Amino acid sequence: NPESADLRALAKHLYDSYIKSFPLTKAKARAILTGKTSPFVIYDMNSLMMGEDKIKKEVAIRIFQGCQFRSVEAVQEITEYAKSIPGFVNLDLNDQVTLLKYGVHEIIYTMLASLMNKDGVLISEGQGFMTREFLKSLRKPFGDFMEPKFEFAVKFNALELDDSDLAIFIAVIILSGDRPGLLNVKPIEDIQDNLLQALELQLKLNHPESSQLFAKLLQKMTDLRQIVTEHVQLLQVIKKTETDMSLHPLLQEIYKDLY
């Protein structure tokens, strides 16, 4: 019960910190996508054109770079969140850097799911919606860059997690003892073990009807690793065909010798 209390207090701390760290939450995204509050819809080139006035070189490059710029803002928010996870800033600084390098894209994809449905994605802080079909229409090699993310999101969203759940799950992901090059695995696994028990208790309290949710969520962590792998490869291709396209230097730091 004092442990129970501690675990609930940890869940609460992380939820509070998540809210502070991430302006566009799942609750906020769901309210927008279901009308409880509509986004300008971009479904083709003409609507993209009309969209540029209403909300905020070649189109496919502009959209891809838009995705990168949004990722950069997510890295910032995730880094702030990570600093609030009890124990994190007390780790070896080399290890903190390794945990962020490998963790940030997995979190990006997790949280991107909140903004997605099977037909498209919220953009521009919820002021626009870009259709999946439109993102598939872009020229090679950009035609498919979002499809792995959509596929993940549709499956992930079927678990009906809320932000209080997500706050604990993303903490678990960052505190992964199996990242390459970690110097002190045991303190990381110790923190993750607390987070995992917090997660288990949260899901039991918050999703009593979902009998195997904890196990299902652990599997998603593994799935996240593959989208990242596939994304980095996709970037290799693009770095080949598109030598003139500037990449974002923060992302270059993250991607350098990643996998």
Partner: peptide, 17 residues
């Protein structure tokens, strides 16, 4: 603060530290 790979992580270190 400083760390072994800082010279390759100016921007990330800016955020973390």
């Amino acid at each position: 603060x400083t760390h072994h790979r800082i010279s390759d992580y100016x921007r990330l270190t800016x955020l973390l530290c």
